[PDB]
Every structure is written in C-alpha cells, then in structure tokens.
Amino acid sequence: GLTEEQRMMIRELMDAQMKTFDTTFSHFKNFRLPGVEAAKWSQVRKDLCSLKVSLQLRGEDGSVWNYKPPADSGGKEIFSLLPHMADMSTYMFKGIISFAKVISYFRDLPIEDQISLLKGAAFELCQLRFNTVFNAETGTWECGRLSYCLEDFQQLLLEPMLKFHYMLKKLQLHEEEYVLMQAISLFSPDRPGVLQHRVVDQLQEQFAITLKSYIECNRPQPAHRFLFLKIMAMLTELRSINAQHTQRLLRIQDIHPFATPLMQELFGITGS
Incomplete structure (x- = not known):
C-alpha cells in the first residue's frame, strides 16, 4: 500500500545498501592484530573493558586462529585490540560513506552538509550494519571469516551498546526496515554544523513516513503492534549511545593515540 x-525510495536505499555493504567482509584485509591523570586512566580503564571480545579468524584453507584477550592487570595491555578495532571501524566507515554517496537525496545536499551529516551518523550507521551480522544466541558478530565473541551474562546487558544490539535483534527487522533506519539516522537535521536544516528535516520525515507505511502494509501481526514506535525509540537510544561512545573514544585517544586518518576526520581531529 506504498x-x-x-x-522508489525503498528501492534506491536497498540498491545503495546492496552496492556498498560487504556482508561477507571479503574486502576487509591488511588489518592489524594483537601482537604475540590517574583518574583519567581509571576512567579509560573503565571505558575499554565494557566491551570485551575474543577474536576468531578462519583461514581460507580451513585453519583457525583464536585470540583470547588479557585480563586487566593495570597496564597498557588493555590497548592490545585497539589497532585492530580501528582498522575494522575504518573499513565500516568507508562502506557507510559509499552508501551515503550513492543516495540521490544525499548527493543533492551541499557538500558541507554531506560532511556534517556523515560526521554525525557514521558510528550509528556502522552499528545498524553490525546488528545484521549479530548472532544473539551465541553473543557473536559474524563478519565473514572473522568472528567477535563476547567473553563470559545478564550483567553483560548492562552495557548500553550491548543491550542495544540484543533489543534491536529481537525485533526481527527486514532488510528494508534496517536500511530505512540508516536513512533516518543519516538525515538527522540536528547534527552539529548542518546548514540545510529544513531540507534535511523534510527528507528525514519522508523516510520515517515510508517506514511507518511499510510496516503498516507488511506486518499485520499483534507481535508487531507499535513496531514503528519501537524502532524510533531505538534510534533515539542509538543517538545517546553515539554521544557516549564519541566521548569514550576521545578520552582513550587523549592518552593513547589510535584513530586512523579517516577516523580523525570524522571525529574532527586535525593532526596538530
């Protein structure tokens, strides 16, 4: 009933997603791997160990490498996975930038607004894409030949990022619903530095209307009552998590540099 x-709107978004989401992570290569003020640190120590994962790498030959991270022993060993996470984030950010560039509504905005919107939403779009490879039964993000597995329960769901992934996964969204979430997040008129606030807001409203209608046309089941409202509440939560994460990143970066050039751009770091 669309x-x-x-x-057309949904088609263009699905097309952009198809062209720019490497769902098997085939082209994620050359990444780094873990080798073989006091209140700033306790805060930084706090920030890092909220998201602890093991890493599995499956070789094209059938071999498997597994990495189990060190327990916290008050040293720099809490940073062993940062270069790898930086490379993965960077790879995802590129996919997200390519997604945005393919969308007509995005291309038609002024270049300063394009930049300001990507700076505002890159993390959120990355998380939305990561949720589609999240396995909520095994606590694992399955990224092709790489897997990231949460380290041992209900205490894990206390970390907002992780609670976000389980709750979003439980809504069992369609591909179309994910890509509309990406759109709504991308076209948020109230990111720092947006000029065409009115244009972006109208665009955002149209993507939300399309999503609301899509759900009304395709999901009659009592289980999906208020689904549209649940999704918008999750987008609000994701914005909050976005802001928290940015501050974490900047604190860690402040005492232990790790952001790649692309990440520096997106998070406003100048090189001076």
Whole structure:
C-alpha cells in the first residue's frame, strides 16, 4: 500500500545498501592484530573493558586462529585490540560513506552538509550494519571469516551498546526496515554544523513516513503492534549511545593515540 515515490525510495536505499555493504567482509584485509591523570586512566580503564571480545579468524584453507584477550592487570595491555578495532571501524566507515554517496537525496545536499551529516551518523550507521551480522544466541558478530565473541551474562546487558544490539535483534527487522533506519539516522537535521536544516528535516520525515507505511502494509501481526514506535525509540537510544561512545573514544585517544586518518576526520581531529 506504498505510494510510487515510497517504493522508489525503498528501492534506491536497498540498491545503495546492496552496492556498498560487504556482508561477507571479503574486502576487509591488511588489518592489524594483537601482537604475540590517574583518574583519567581509571576512567579509560573503565571505558575499554565494557566491551570485551575474543577474536576468531578462519583461514581460507580451513585453519583457525583464536585470540583470547588479557585480563586487566593495570597496564597498557588493555590497548592490545585497539589497532585492530580501528582498522575494522575504518573499513565500516568507508562502506557507510559509499552508501551515503550513492543516495540521490544525499548527493543533492551541499557538500558541507554531506560532511556534517556523515560526521554525525557514521558510528550509528556502522552499528545498524553490525546488528545484521549479530548472532544473539551465541553473543557473536559474524563478519565473514572473522568472528567477535563476547567473553563470559545478564550483567553483560548492562552495557548500553550491548543491550542495544540484543533489543534491536529481537525485533526481527527486514532488510528494508534496517536500511530505512540508516536513512533516518543519516538525515538527522540536528547534527552539529548542518546548514540545510529544513531540507534535511523534510527528507528525514519522508523516510520515517515510508517506514511507518511499510510496516503498516507488511506486518499485520499483534507481535508487531507499535513496531514503528519501537524502532524510533531505538534510534533515539542509538543517538545517546553515539554521544557516549564519541566521548569514550576521545578520552582513550587523549592518552593513547589510535584513530586512523579517516577516523580523525570524522571525529574532527586535525593532526596538530
């Protein structure tokens, strides 16, 4: 029961997603791997160990490498996985930037607004894409030949990022619903530095209407009552998590540099 413009809208988003989401992570290569003021640190120590994972790498030959991280012993060993996470984030950010560039509504904005929107939403879009490879039964993000597995329970869901992933996964969204979430997040008129606030807001509203209608046309089940509202609440939560993470990143970066050039750009770091 979608309008023609709504169907075109979904088609263009799905097309952009298809072209720019390397769902098997085939082209994620050359990444780093772990080798073989006091209140700033306790805060930084606090920040890091909220998200502890083991790493599995499956070789194209059938071999497997597994990495188990060190327990915290008050040293720099809490940073062993940062170069790898930086490379993965950077790879995801590139996919997200390519996604945005393919979308007509995004291309038509002024270049300063494009930049300001990507700076505001890159993390959120990355998390939305990561949720589609999240396995909520095994606590694992399955990224092709790489897996990231949460280290041992209900105490884990206390970390907001992790609670976000389980709760979003439980809504069992369609591909179309994810890509509309990406759109709504991308076109947020109230990111720092947006000029065409009115244009972006109208665009955002159209993507939300399309999503609301899509759900009304395709999901009659009592289980999906208020689904549209649940999704918008999750987008609000994701914005909050986005802000928290940015501050974490900047604190860690302040005492232990790790951001790649692309990450420096997106998070406003100048090189001076």
